[PDB]
PDB file of C-alpha atoms in Angstrom:
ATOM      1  CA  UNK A 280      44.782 -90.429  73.431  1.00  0.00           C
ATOM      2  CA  UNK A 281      47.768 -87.992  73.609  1.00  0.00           C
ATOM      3  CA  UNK A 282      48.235 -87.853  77.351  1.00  0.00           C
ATOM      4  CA  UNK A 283      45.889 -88.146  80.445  1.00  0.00           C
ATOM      5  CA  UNK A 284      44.890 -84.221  80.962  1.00  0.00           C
ATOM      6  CA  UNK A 285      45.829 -82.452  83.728  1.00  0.00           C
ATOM      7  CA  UNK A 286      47.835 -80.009  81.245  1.00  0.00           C
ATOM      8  CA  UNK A 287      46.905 -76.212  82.644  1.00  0.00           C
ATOM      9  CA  UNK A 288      47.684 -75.555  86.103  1.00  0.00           C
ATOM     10  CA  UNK A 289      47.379 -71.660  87.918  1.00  0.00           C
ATOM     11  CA  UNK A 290      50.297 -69.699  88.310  1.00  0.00           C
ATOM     12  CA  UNK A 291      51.390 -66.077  89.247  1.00  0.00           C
ATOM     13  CA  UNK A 292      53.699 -64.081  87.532  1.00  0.00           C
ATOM     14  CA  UNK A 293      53.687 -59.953  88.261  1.00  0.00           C
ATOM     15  CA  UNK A 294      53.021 -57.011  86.089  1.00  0.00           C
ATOM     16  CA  UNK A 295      55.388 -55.695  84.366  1.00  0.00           C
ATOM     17  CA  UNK A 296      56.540 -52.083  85.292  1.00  0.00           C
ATOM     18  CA  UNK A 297      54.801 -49.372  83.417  1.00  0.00           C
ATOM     19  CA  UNK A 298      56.266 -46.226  81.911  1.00  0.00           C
ATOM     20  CA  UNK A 299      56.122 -43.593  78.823  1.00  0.00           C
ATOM     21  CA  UNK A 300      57.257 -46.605  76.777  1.00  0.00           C
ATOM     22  CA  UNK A 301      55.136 -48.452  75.592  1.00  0.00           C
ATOM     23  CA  UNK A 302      51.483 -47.460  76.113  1.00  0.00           C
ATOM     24  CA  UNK A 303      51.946 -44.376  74.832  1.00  0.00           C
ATOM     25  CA  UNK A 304      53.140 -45.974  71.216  1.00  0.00           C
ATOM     26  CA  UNK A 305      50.566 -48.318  71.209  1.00  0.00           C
ATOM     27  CA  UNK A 306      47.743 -46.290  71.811  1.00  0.00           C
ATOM     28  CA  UNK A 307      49.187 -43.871  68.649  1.00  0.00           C
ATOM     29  CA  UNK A 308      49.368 -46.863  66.456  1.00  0.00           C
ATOM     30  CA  UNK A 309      46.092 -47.926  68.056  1.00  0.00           C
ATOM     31  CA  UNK A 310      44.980 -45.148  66.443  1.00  0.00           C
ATOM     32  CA  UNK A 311      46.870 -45.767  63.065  1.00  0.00           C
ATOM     33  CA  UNK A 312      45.248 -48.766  62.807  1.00  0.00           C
ATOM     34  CA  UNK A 313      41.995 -47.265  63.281  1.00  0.00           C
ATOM     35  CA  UNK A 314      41.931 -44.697  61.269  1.00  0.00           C
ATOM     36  CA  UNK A 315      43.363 -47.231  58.661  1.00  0.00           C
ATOM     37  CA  UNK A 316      39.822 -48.582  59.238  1.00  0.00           C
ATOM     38  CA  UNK A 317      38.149 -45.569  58.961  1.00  0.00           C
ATOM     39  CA  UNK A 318      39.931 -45.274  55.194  1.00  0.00           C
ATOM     40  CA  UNK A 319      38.549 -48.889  54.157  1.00  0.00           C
ATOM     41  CA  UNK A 320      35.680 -48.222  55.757  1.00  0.00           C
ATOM     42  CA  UNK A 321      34.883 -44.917  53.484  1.00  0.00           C
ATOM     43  CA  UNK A 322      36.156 -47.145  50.451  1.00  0.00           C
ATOM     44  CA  UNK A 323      33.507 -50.215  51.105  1.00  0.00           C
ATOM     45  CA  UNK A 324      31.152 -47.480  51.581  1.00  0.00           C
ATOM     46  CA  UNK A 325      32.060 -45.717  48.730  1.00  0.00           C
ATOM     47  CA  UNK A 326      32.099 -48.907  46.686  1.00  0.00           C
ATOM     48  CA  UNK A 327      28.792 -50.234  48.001  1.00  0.00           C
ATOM     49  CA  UNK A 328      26.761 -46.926  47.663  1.00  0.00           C
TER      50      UNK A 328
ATOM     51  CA  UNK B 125      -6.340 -44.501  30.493  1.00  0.00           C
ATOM     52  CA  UNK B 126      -6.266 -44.419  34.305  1.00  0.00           C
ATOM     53  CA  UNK B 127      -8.612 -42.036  36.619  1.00  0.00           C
ATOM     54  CA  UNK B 128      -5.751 -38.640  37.052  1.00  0.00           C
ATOM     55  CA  UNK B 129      -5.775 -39.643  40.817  1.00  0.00           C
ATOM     56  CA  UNK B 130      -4.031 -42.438  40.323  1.00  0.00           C
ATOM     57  CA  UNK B 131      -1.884 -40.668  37.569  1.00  0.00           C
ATOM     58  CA  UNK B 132      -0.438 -38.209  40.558  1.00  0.00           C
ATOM     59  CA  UNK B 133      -0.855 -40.898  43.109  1.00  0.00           C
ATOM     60  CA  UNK B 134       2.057 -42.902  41.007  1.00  0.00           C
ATOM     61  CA  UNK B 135       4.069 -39.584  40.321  1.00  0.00           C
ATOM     62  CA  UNK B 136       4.281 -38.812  43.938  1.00  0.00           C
ATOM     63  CA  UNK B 137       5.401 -42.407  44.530  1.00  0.00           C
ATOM     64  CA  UNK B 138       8.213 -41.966  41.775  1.00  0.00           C
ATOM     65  CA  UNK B 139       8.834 -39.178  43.095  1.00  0.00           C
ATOM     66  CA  UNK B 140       9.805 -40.507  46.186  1.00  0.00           C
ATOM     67  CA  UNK B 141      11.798 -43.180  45.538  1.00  0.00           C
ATOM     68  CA  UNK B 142      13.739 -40.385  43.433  1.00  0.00           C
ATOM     69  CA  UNK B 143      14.395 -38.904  46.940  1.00  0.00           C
ATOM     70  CA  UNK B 144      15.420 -42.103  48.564  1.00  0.00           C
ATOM     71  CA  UNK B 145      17.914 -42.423  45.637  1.00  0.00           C
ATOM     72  CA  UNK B 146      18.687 -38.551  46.008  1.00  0.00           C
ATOM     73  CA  UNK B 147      19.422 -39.826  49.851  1.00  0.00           C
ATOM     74  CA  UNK B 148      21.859 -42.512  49.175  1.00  0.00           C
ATOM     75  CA  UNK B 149      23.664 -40.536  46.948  1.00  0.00           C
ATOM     76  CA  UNK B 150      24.106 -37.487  49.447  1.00  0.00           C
ATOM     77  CA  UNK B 151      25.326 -40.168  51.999  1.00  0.00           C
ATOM     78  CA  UNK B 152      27.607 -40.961  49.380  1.00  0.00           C
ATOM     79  CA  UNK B 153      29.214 -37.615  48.832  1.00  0.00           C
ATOM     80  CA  UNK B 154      29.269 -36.969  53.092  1.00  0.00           C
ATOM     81  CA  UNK B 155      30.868 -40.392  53.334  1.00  0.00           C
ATOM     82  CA  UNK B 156      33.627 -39.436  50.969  1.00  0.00           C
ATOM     83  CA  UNK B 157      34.058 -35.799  51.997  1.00  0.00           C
ATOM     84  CA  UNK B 158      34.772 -37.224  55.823  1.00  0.00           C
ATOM     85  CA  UNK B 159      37.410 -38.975  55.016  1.00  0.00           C
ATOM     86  CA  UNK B 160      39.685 -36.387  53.836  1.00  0.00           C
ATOM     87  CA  UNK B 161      37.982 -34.331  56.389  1.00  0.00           C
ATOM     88  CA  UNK B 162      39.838 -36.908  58.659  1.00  0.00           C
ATOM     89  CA  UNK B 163      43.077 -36.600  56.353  1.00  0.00           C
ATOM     90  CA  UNK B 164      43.797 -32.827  57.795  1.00  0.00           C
ATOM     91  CA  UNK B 165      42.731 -30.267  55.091  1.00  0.00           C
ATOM     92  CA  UNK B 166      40.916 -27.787  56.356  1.00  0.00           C
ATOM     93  CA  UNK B 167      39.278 -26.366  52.974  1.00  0.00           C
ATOM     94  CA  UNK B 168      36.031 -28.273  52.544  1.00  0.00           C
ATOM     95  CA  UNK B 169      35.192 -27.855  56.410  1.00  0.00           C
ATOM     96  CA  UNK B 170      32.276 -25.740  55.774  1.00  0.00           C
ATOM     97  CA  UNK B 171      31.089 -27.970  52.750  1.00  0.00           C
ATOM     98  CA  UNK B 172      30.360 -30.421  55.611  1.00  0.00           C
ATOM     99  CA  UNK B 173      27.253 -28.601  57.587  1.00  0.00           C
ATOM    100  CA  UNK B 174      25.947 -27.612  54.302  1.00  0.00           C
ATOM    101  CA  UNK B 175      25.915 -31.856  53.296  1.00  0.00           C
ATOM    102  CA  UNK B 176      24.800 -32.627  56.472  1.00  0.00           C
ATOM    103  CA  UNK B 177      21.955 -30.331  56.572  1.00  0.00           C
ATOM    104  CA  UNK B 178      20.721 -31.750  53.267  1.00  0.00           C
ATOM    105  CA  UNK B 179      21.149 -35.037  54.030  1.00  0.00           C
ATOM    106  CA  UNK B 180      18.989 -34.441  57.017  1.00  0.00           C
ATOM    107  CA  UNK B 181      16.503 -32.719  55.444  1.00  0.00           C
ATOM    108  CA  UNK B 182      15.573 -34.983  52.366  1.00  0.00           C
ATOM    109  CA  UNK B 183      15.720 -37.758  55.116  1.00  0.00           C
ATOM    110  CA  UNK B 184      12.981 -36.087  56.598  1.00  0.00           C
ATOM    111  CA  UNK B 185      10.661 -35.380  54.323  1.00  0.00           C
ATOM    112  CA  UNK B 186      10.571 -37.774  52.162  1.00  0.00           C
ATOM    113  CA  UNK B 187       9.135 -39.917  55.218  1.00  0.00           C
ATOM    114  CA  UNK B 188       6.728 -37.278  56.033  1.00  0.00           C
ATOM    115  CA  UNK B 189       5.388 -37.723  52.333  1.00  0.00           C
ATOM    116  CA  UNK B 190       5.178 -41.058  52.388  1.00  0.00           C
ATOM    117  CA  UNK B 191       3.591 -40.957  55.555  1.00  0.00           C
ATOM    118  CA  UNK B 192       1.090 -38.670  53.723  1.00  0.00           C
ATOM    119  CA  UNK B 193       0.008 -41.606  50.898  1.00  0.00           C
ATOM    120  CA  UNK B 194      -0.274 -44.110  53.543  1.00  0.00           C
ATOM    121  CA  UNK B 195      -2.284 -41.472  55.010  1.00  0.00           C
ATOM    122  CA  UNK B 196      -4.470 -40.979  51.960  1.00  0.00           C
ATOM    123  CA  UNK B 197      -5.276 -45.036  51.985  1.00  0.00           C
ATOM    124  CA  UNK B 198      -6.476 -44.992  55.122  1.00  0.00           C
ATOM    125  CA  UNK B 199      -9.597 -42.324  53.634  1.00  0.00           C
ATOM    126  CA  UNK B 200      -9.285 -44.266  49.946  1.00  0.00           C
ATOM    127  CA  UNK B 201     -11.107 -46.982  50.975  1.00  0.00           C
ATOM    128  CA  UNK B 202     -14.656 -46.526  50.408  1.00  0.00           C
ATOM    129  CA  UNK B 203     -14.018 -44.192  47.382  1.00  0.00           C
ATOM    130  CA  UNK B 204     -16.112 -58.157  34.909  1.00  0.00           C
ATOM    131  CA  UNK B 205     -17.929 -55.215  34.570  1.00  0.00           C
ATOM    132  CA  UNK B 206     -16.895 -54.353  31.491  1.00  0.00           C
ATOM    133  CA  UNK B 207     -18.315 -57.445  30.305  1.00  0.00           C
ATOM    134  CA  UNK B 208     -21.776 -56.027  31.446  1.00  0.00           C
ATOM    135  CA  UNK B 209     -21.432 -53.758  28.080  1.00  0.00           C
ATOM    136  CA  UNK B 210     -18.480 -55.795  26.014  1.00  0.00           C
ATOM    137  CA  UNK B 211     -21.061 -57.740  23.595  1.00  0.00           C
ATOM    138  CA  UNK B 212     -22.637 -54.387  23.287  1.00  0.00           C
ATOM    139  CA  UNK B 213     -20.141 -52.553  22.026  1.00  0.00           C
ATOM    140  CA  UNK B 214     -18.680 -55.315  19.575  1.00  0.00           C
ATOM    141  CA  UNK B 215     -22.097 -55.702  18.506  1.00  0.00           C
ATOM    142  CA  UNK B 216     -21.994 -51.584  17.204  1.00  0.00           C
ATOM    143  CA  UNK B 217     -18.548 -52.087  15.558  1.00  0.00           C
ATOM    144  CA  UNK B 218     -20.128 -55.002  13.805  1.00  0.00           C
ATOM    145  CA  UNK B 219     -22.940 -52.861  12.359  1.00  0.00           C
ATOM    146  CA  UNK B 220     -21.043 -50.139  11.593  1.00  0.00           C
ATOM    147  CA  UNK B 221     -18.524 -52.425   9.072  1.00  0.00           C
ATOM    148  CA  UNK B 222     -21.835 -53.478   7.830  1.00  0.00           C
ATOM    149  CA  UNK B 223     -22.085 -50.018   7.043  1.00  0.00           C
ATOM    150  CA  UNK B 224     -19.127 -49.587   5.162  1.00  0.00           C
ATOM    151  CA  UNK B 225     -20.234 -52.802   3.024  1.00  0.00           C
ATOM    152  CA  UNK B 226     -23.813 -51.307   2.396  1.00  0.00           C
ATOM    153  CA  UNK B 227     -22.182 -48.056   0.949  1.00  0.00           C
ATOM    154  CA  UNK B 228     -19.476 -48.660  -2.134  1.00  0.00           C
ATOM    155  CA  UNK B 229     -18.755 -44.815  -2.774  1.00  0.00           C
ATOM    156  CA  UNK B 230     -16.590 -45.263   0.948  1.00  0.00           C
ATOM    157  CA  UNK B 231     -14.546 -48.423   0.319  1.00  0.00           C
ATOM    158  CA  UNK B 232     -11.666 -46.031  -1.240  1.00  0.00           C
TER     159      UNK B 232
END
């Protein structure tokens, strides 16, 4: 009832440059976050067992 | 009482769910000593081969002995009745009060 849809049409935009920046932090927090997991994991475990 | 085989046929049962529980706990302890294995400390390395090893071990065996009963009913089979005698014996414990009325120098 909003509107007749036709809402999402293709488009192109490029890729960003790459560098040190940025993939190099995420994948490190990647990791935080992961090991994070690993720490609840052993927790639950811990808790369950 | 029960037949004996059935006496050690339970206590190798029990005794195996003791080992499952023996099991769980181990994965317990090598669950918690991995994650400060992860944390960096360096100390309680060679703890972790010993755990492991266990672990492994009384994971193995205890399905080999369990194995082993199911085993042992496969060759089982083939190896109210007490009705058949029940009057019977009521009818000697009924004689034998008798007894014990006929005499009065034992009803002390």
């Amino acid at each position: 009832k909003v509107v007749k849809p036709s809402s999402l049409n293709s488009d192109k935009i490029p890729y960003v440059a790459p560098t040190k920046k940025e993939y190099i932090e995420l994948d490190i927090l990647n990791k935080g976050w992961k090991l994070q997991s690993l720490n609840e994991s052993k927790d639950l475990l811990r808790a369950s067992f | 009482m029960q037949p004996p085989y059935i006496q050690e046929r339970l206590k190798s049962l029990n005794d195996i769910e003791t080992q499952l529980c023996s099991m769980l706990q181990e994965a317990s302890q090598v669950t918690f000593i991995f994650g400060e294995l992860k944390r960096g400390n360096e100390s309680v390395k060679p703890q972790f081969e010993n755990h492991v090893k266990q672990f492994y071990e009384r994971l193995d065996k205890s399905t080999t002995q369990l194995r082993k009963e199911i085993q042992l009913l496969d060759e089982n089979v083939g190896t109210n009745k007490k009705a058949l005698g029940q009057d019977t014996e009521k009818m000697e414990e009924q004689l034998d009060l008798l007894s014990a009325i006929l005499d009065p120098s034992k009803s002390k």
